[PDB]
Amino acid sequence: MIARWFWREWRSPSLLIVWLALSLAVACVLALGNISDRMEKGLSQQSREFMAGDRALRSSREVPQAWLEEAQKRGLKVGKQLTFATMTFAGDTPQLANVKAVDDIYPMYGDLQTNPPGLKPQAGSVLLAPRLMALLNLKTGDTIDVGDATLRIAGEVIQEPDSGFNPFQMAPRLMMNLADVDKTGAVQPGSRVTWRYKFGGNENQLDGYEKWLLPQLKPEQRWYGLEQDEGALGRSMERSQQFLLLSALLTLLLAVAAVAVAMNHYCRSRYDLVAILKTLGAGRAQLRKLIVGQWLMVLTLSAVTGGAIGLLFENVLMVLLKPVLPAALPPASLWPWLWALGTMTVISLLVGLRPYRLLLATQPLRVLRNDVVANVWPLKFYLPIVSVVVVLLLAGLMGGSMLLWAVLAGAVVLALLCGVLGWMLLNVLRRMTLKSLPLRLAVSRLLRQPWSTLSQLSAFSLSFMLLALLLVLRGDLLDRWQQQLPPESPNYFLINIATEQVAPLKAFLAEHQIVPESFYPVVRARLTAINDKPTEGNEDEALNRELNLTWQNTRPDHNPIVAGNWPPKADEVSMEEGLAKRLNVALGDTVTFMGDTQEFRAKVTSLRKVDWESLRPNFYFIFPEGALDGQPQSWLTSFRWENGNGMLTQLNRQFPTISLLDIGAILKQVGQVLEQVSRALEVMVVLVTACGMLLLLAQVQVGMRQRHQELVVWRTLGAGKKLLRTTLWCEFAMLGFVSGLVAAIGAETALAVLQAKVFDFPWEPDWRLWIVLPCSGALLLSLFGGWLGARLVKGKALFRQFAG
Amino acid sequence: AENIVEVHHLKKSVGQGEHELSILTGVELVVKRGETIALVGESGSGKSTLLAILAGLDDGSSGEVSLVGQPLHNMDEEARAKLRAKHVGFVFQSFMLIPTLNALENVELPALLRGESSAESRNGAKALLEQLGLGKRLDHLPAQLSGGEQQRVALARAFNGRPDVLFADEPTGNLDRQTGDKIADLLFSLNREHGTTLIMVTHDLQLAARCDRCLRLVNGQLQEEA
Amino acid sequence: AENIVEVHHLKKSVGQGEHELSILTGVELVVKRGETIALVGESGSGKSTLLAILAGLDDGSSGEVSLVGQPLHNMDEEARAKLRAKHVGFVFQSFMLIPTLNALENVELPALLRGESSAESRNGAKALLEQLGLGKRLDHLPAQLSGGEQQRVALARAFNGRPDVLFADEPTGNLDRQTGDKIADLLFSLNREHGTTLIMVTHDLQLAARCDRCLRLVNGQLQEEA
Numbered sequence A: 001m002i003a004r005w006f007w008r009e010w011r012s013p014s015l016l017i018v019w020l021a022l023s024l025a026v027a028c029v030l031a032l033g034n035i036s037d038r039m040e041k042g043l044s045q046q047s048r049e050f051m052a053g054d055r056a057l058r059s060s061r062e063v064p065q066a067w068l069e070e071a072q073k074r075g076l077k078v079g080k081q082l083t084f085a086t087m088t089f090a091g092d093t094p095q096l097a098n099v100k101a102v103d104d105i106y107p108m109y110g111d112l113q114t115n116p117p118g119l120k121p122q123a124g125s126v127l128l129a130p131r132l133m134a135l136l137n138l139k140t141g142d143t144i145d146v147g148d149a150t151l152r153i154a155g156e157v158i159q160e161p162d163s164g165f166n167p168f169q170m171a172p173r174l175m176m177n178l179a180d181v182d183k184t185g186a187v188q189p190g191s192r193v194t195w196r197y198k199f200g201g202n203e204n205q206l207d208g209y210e211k212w213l214l215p216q217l218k219p220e221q222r223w224y225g226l227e228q229d230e231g232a233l234g235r236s237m238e239r240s241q242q243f244l245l246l247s248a249l250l251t252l253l254l255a256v257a258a259v260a261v262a263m264n265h266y267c268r269s270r271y272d273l274v275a276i277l278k279t280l281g282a283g284r285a286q287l288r289k290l291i292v293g294q295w296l297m298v299l300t301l302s303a304v305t306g307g308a309i310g311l312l313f314e315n316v317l318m319v320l321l322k323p324v325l326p327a328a329l330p331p332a333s334l335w336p337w338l339w340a341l342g343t344m345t346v347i348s349l350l351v352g353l354r355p356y357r358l359l360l361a362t363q364p365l366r367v368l369r370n371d372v373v374a375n376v377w378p379l380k381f382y383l384p385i386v387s388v389v390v391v392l393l394l395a396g397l398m399g400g401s402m403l404l405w406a407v408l409a410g411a412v413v414l415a416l417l418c419g420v421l422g423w424m425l426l427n428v429l430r431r432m433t434l435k436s437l438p439l440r441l442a443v444s445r446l447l448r449q450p451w452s453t454l455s456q457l458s459a460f461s462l463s464f465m466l467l468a469l470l471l472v473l474r475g476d477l478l479d480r481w482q483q484q485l486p487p488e489s490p491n492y493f494l495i496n497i498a499t500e501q502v503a504p505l506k507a508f509l510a511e512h513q514i515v516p517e518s519f520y521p522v523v524r525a526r527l528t529a530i531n532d533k534p535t536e537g538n539e540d541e542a543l544n545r546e547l548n549l550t551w552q553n554t555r556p557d558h559n560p561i562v563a564g565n566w567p568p569k570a571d572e573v574s575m576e577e578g579l580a581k582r583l584n585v586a587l588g589d590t591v592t593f594m595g596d597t598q599e600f601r602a603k604v605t606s607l608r609k610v611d612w613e614s615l616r617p618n619f620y621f622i623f624p625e626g627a628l629d630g631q632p633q634s635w636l637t638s639f640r641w642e643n644g645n646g647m648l649t650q651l652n653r654q655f656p657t658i659s660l661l662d663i664g665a666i667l668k669q670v671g672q673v674l675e676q677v678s679r680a681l682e683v684m685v686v687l688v689t690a691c692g693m694l695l696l697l698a699q700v701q702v703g704m705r706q707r708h709q710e711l712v713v714w715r716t717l718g719a720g721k722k723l724l725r726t727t728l729w730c731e732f733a734m735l736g737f738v739s740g741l742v743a744a745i746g747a748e749t750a751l752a753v754l755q756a757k758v759f760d761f762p763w764e765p766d767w768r769l770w771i772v773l774p775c776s777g778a779l780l781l782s783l784f785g786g787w788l789g790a791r792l793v794k795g796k797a798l799f800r801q802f803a804g
Numbered sequence B, C: 001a002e003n004i005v006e007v008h009h010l011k012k013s014v015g016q017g018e019h020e021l022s023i024l025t026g027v028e029l030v031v032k033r034g035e036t037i038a039l040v041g042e043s044g045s046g047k048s049t050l051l052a053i054l055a056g057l058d059d060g061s062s063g064e065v066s067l068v069g070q071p072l073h074n075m076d077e078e079a080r081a082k083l084r085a086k087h088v089g090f091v092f093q094s095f096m097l098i099p100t101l102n103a104l105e106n107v108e109l110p111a112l113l114r115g116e117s118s119a120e121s122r123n124g125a126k127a128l129l130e131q132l133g134l135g136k137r138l139d140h141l142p143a144q145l146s147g148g149e150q151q152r153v154a155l156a157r158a159f160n161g162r163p164d165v166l167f168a169d170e171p172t173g174n175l176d177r178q179t180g181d182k183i184a185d186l187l188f189s190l191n192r193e194h195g196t197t198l199i200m201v202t203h204d205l206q207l208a209a210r211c212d213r214c215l216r217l218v219n220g221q222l223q224e225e226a
């Protein structure tokens, strides 16, 4: 009897739409979370291929062996890289060279491009960059004097995964083994030996070891990851990762909104039934049993079908995604299941708790006659408490990331603006007179029930804001990535260029059908002090390195300028904003630089937001033109070539002093990473927008189900199809237009905070969004409403369906 | 035309398979302009079903139904809805009042559908409702009212329709002798003035006696009583 | 309890601010056990409101209600529900039926709420329903019935519990003469053979006359009439 009753209820339109909406929300969250987690894990695995290590530890001196012994006990793979640059002698030809001592583990991941291939640093053997023995006039299989050792030339070093770009290079690379450090006889406890430690293993082992090692550190050793040597390519990966998390969060938020409204409607549908049960003497025990049994059965069925649908979606999508993926992604973690079931349960309980207690403490006749229900838990106190609980739970789930806080700030501004604008709109419309009949009907319907209208409007605004925020963020990220790697780019660099040699090469570049590029003149030095305080002692990478300076007459085109004014005058130099922040310096600070016994002083007058991602060289300091003539003015240029190399030989004969660097390997490396990240963003955006559209359809269907009785009465009276379709069009168009207008402000605020705090991109108020979001939202809502109303009005004996 | 309603061999059954049940087993009925026909019968004889099928709210199993010279079995839903809006007024058993809007909007509805100005329709509905004896419950919701008030609201809506043909299901179901008498006087005055044909399914013997013709529904058949 | 129902200067008003509206203005009523009293009055006189008050389904502004000798006002909702289950059967004016339960289960529901057996309550409900001549619509949903059938279903649901006191609102409102007489006979037989006090609100003159006392409700005051 009870089973047949439950099944009959489950076939009623109201319960049916509630179940469908809940199941769709669960499928939404589960599938999106699973896809996001698997794809991010695949991205991390891909990133492991260019680092030879999952995590990196950096220090200027040897760490105690106890930590590495613990890591080995912790079942972790450890590699070591402890080297710097020093002098070498190819007989009697001194030459600076950057050596690199690595253990047999390295390369732990990836591949070591060598000529001939398949060579590793062994005792008594060294591998050298082609420029190195091109200048040293030695060949493979010969012997080279390094420090106080004579080691055989095993082969060349075409490329290594942990190379970076380093446009301001000085000396080539010399691969060599960790065990032969002492035999060099040239290593000194002076300059940093660039102590780097690579750790690899499962996520749990790495996390536990990191937590174990966190208190055992000093402010000279940094634990990090996705930060390659030299070039900061991995930063892009990091950005992508954040985006993925954001996407998941967005879906979650969307789901919550739908569930809320759906469940609210469901609760209302039960009102009269509870009254009847209270009339028949149903005690508290039996009433609780029946009502919460129906609620729990609905929740369980919705969860089950949602899980099944989400799993089916995930499997079919990953099958259909075989060409895009480079390899099968690892299985997802379990946290999406929590992220779905827990949110649906908690939102359901939060929405349904108040009506349950309210009904349990009100005489049935008051409920039936729509009279004054018991004044318990007023909305003015219930709503803030619910919002606080929800946001606290969201903080717990997310982990206190700035993404959640930015989203919440946007949502709060959106809600406040929504209330104000709704009140103003009601006041305006109460005094407004129209002429079109469908418009009059829509306006009257919107005005008659203000609070329900406001709830619907707020939900739609939230959905539109989330979608628009995601779309704009995707556009900005794609534009930034496209700008980072132009389709054509100089694949060759020229360094160690004398000033008087600038004119010849240019002509040669003009001669050999090559477009010349910028000619940044570089001077290497070290800052002596800031505000007369000797900087020796502060832990900054800038202090223990040869800083590079340049002088530009005009504004740097590709380098944006944010703070200060351009150009800096005498004894004033534009500086990078990030370096100023990490160095805690202000404008006009007395900074003196020591180089070639020509220590010159300058001030600070402008800060430029410099992105360390483009292949174009970037300088922390841009001195005024002709300010450091005493220092040796080196020159550096770049050009792109794609066919043959004989002209390269001609240039080498022409200027054997000038060094030539190829970066085709680096371009190949970055291209795959960029392509994979872009595919990730495209797929995530498509999935989220489609499923958000589905949730919007669900919300609109529920909203129309609310107005079912009025529509049925209208049809019975004899309203034509055209009139009903037009009225629904107009009503939902106004609703969507206002909702999108509010969502524009909300999305702008959240996006501004997110860019200023997470993705470090400049924020510009885009009126194009202001004009696109409201119109598009109104059109979408009108389309959905018209279609669903046309579907509903069709049929016969509609008057009989009024009772349902 | 003079033949307002023509019904030939009307048959209607409901249910599916074992649940199939026959209600109308061959019905014939011809009415002229301005006539007043009261319909009586035992409970569950199908009177409401016959009334619904007469007004084109649904479709019979088989037969010929013509209203104002239009064969109701030969147009789609839209033409039927247009005809209903043009000519017919209806009063149901449960009155299907919209619980969201107050009484005034419920009475206002048909005038807005016709296409009058909002103020004109508002004052007209107000005058009609005051005429029906409900001038003190204008803003009440349908739940707030009582059975008699809800019935009078439905009657007010039908009257505001100002129809050529008026169908009623128990106009005086929830009314005493006094309010029932006033309602009957209202209906018959309307018939005398506007010449509106009146079909009503009633249980009161007085109202049937006042009516021009009395038809009893037995075994899905029509029998003249007087 | 010699007097099942005791009312002492009970007043009740609805609405707030200018929208306030008084209905009951002090009522004194004592209902000896086993008596039959019929309430009459014009529409909008508050009869349904008073009847709802007497069963504890609502609370008035002030007064004393002593249903079966209990201080209803000094009694929470749960005890009220328990008392109603034990001793009170109620009938609505709109039949307030659950639209997703067929007639048999709808009648059976009070027994299940009281925790009675499925089989015995089932056969008892079957006997009650066939007693009302609804034996051919046992599995029908409420949307499949007419006004008379729905009213008879509500009456059967009231009769199922065999309560000490039975409240009825227009028991024969939507029924013909013969069916109304049959229903009245069943009610009076129940009272005679079970000593069940019953309070009806109806516009039927014959049904009221058959009752022991007839009280007219005027201006929130009860006066004996017939």
Ligand SMILES: Nc1ncnc2c1ncn2[C@@H]1O[C@H](COP(=O)(O)OP(=O)(O)NP(=O)(O)O)[C@@H](O)[C@H]1O
Pocket: B014, B015, B021, B023, B041, B042, B043, B044, B045, B046, B047, B048, B049, B050, B093, C137, C143, C144, C145, C146, C147, C148, C149
């Ligand atoms: N949807 C349905 N499915 C099956 N049977 C139905 C359905 N609707 C109505 N019936 C049956 O048909 C009968 C006639 O219904 P209805 O047309 O309301 O009769 P009526 O003469 O109006 N009865 P009343 O208003 O109580 O005097 C009902 O009493 C049921 O027995």
Ligand SMILES: Nc1ncnc2c1ncn2[C@@H]1O[C@H](COP(=O)(O)OP(=O)(O)NP(=O)(O)O)[C@@H](O)[C@H]1O
Pocket: A369, A370, A371, B137, B143, B144, B145, B146, B147, B148, B149, B174, C014, C015, C021, C023, C041, C042, C043, C044, C045, C046, C047, C048, C049, C050, C093
């Ligand atoms: N919830 C309410 N809010 C405001 N006014 C109400 C409410 N309920 C009832 N009323 C008013 O009180 C009057 C009495 O209600 P009710 O108790 O249904 O009267 P009644 O005598 O039962 N009418 P009827 O059923 O037509 O014979 C109504 O007609 C309304 O004017």
Ligand SMILES: [Mg+2]
Pocket: B047, B048, B093, C146, C147
């Ligand atoms: Mg009927």
Ligand SMILES: [Mg+2]
Pocket: B146, B147, C047, C048, C049, C093
């Ligand atoms: Mg009443």
